[PDB]
Amino acid sequence: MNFNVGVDFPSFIAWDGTTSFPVKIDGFNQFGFTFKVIEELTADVPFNIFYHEASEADPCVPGPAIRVPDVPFCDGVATADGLATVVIPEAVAVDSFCAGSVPCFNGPWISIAPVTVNADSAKVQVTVTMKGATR
Amino acid sequence: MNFNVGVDFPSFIAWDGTTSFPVKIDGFNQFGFTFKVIEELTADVPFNIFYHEASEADPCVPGPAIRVPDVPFCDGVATADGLATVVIPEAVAVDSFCAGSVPCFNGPWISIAPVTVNADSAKVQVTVTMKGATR
Amino acid sequence: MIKLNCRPLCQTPTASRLVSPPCFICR
Amino acid sequence: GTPENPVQTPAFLAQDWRRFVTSFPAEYGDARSVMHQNVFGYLAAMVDANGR
Numbered sequence: 277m278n279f280n281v282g283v284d285f286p287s288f289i290a291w292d293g294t295t296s297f298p299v300k301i302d303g304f305n306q307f308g309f310t311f312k313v314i315e316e317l318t319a320d321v322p323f324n325i326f327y328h329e330a331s332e333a334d335p336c337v338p339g340p341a342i343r344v345p346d347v348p349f350c351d352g353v354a355t356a357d358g359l360a361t362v363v364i365p366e367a368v369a370v371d372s373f374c375a376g377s378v379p380c381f382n383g384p385w386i387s388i389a390p391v392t393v394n395a396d397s398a399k400v401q402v403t404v405t406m407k408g409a410t411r
Numbered sequence: 412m413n414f415n416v417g418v419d420f421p422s423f424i425a426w427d428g429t430t431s432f433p434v435k436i437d438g439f440n441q442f443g444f445t446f447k448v449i450e451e452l453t454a455d456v457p458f459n460i461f462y463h464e465a466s467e468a469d470p471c472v473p474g475p476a477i478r479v480p481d482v483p484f485c486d487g488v489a490t491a492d493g494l495a496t497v498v499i500p501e502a503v504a505v506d507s508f509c510a511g512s513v514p515c516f517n518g519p520w521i522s523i524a525p526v527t528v529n530a531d532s533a534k535v536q537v538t539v540t541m542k543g544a545t546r
Numbered sequence: 547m548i549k550l551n552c553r554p555l556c557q558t559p560t561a562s563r564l565v566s567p568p569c570f571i572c573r
Numbered sequence: 574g575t576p577e578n579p580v581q582t583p584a585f586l587a588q589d590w591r592r593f594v595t596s597f598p599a600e601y602g603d604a605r606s607v608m609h610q611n612v613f614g615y616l617a618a619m620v621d622a623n624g625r
Contacts, residue, residue: 279542281443282510287422287538288447297449308416311550312423314432336506355547362548371471372554375417403422403538418551435555471556570624
């Protein structure tokens with residue numbers, strides 16, 4: 277028995293190692309990221325998380341990138357500069373995957389990209405999964 | 412509030428427009444495909460579905476690709492060649508996605524690649540979404 | 547900063563030797 | 574040691590206790606022995622040539 281999961285839980289590419297694609301989370305009420313590495317890394321690779329606002333000239337085109345603000349939890353540390361980031365540790369192996377998501381939505385489009393385009397940044401793939409279509 | 416959907420429904424890249432990556436599905440009991448196009452197409456693009464099995468030399472590395480066979484339904488007609496195929500229509504709109512799945516599993520790895528590599532097959536992106544874990 | 551969740555896709559059981567006392571030899 | 578270079582050493586073997594205890598004259602009657610606990614512990618921890 278198999279199901280057409282893509283009907284209920286579609287997924288979209290977010291990072292290929294050479295470019296980043298904005299993902300429209302507007303119609304879906306929940307989402308999360310997923311990471312995987314296709315080769316051994318040389319050091320941790322930090323990723324910046326952005327979001328876009330609807331452009332003026334068109335209601336379905338993303339605007340310029342806006343950096344997502346941090347959100348401290350019930351108690352604990354806060355990011356040094358008050359922003360959100362994710363760091364992929366060096367100990368990660370090729371045959372494993374990592375999952376994570378931000379606590380809040382903000383704009384209707386979301387995106388993610390590395391801090392610097394180095395040789396290691398090309399070894400990481402990022403995919404976005406959405407759940408519970410609302411429209 | 413949004414959840415960490417990446418923990419229960421991880422997804423992986425299959426075809427990013429230049430390369431095809433084998434996806435290991437044995438750890439999950441359901442899966443499906445999602446097709447998105449990032450601009451207008453010029454003609455129909457057909458895709459072949461493959462599956463692999465553990466290589467003789469190493470039990471965690473895939474062997475050469477084998478092509479998935481077709482299976483007909485109750486009130487239906489088998490395809491002429493007896494092999495599974497997926498074709499994306501020319502009239503597909505950029506701002507929508509289509510999801511389809513295969514009825515059977517076969518080997519523990521699955522893959523997908525266009526029948527012909529050209530300037531049109533590079534406009535499509537395919538991502539595989541799993542469901543349920545058993546390890 | 548977000549906390550990730552990690553899990554492996556493959557497994558390889560640890561293979562450790564077992565050692566037994568050597569034959570008796572007078573001190 | 575070896576016959577070419579003998580090495581005389583004081584010793585106390587299992588059979589010495591047996592000989593000593595059994596050599597008591599029979600007429601004098603039943604006897605009782607007195608000894609230190611460590612001596613009995615040493616006696617009971619003997620092993621033959623094979624380690625048993």
